[PDB]
Each structure stands twice: as structure tokens, then as C-alpha cells.
């Protein structure tokens, strides 16, 4: 029925039960966690290229 954040608006099946505004907040949250996670991965991968280069020239 109604928005799962308890907004008082109706949620949309195409948005996991959320309303236009509450779904935009979830979307923004998810996209911040994705950027953090990708940053962490890009650190791993940069550490690894520098090492692979360093042992290559050692």
C-alpha cells in the first residue's frame, strides 16, 4: 500500500515500495556506498600496480 519509509505517500512497486522522494533518497544512499566501495577498490588496484612496477624494476 503506502510508502515503506512511512511517509504518508503511496509507494510505487517499481521502486521497492517507496515513493518518488523516498526512493530518490535510497538511490542517493546506494550511489554513495558504491562510490566509497569503488574508491576502496581503486586504492587496492593502485597499490598493486606500484608494487608490480617496483618488483619489475627491482
Amino acid at each position: 500500500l503506502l510508502c515503506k519509509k512511512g511517509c504518508g505517500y503511496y509507494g510505487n512497486p517499481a521502486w521497492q515500495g517507496f515513493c518518488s522522494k523516498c526512493w530518490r533518497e535510497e538511490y542517493h544512499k546506494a550511489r554513495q556506498k558504491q562510490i566509497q566501495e569503488d574508491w576502496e577498490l581503486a586504492e587496492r588496484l593502485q597499490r598493486e600496480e606500484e608494487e608490480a612496477f617496483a618488483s619489475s624494476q627491482s
Binding site: 550511489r31 562510490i35 566501495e37 569503488d38 574508491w39 577498490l41 581503486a42 586504492e43 588496484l45 593502485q46
Partner: protein, 73 residues
């Protein structure tokens, strides 16, 4: 549309792109702005390194998406 490409060193590149653009195409675009050759570039989104022959839409990269760039050595 715009997407952003973040480096680890304090720079965000804004690119003009289409969901249909190849990753190779996007790296050419980064060569244009930044003078970095395509073969020195690794791009990451949603936990994955992006492949040269696939397109932004293959990865559900939409308007305002942020990718990360790492340099290949």
C-alpha cells in the same frame, strides 16, 4: 549526458558521453582532456574494471554516474 571520472589524486574529469559509448571511446575522451593514453588507464564502476569492447549502458552507467580512474604502469 555527464559522467564523472575521479582519480586518487584530487581531480574529477567531467565527460560528455552517450549510454552507447564504448569504454575505449570513453578512454579516448580522457586522452583528449588529460593527455593520458588509453593503455595507461583502468576504469572502475560498481566494483568492476570496465572492458574496452563493452559500453556504458552495459554497466548501467547513467546520468551523473561516478567512475574511478587508476593508472596502469
Amino acid at each position: 549526458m555527464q559522467i564523472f571520472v575521479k582519480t586518487l589524486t584530487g581531480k574529477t574529469i567531467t565527460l560528455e558521453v552517450e549510454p552507447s559509448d564504448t569504454i575505449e571511446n570513453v578512454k579516448a575522451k580522457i586522452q583528449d582532456k588529460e593527455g593520458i593514453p588509453p593503455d595507461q588507464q583502468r576504469l572502475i564502476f560498481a566494483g568492476k574494471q570496465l572492458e574496452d569492447g563493452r559500453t556504458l549502458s552495459d554497466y548501467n552507467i547513467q546520468k551523473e554516474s561516478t567512475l574511478h580512474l587508476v593508472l596502469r604502469l
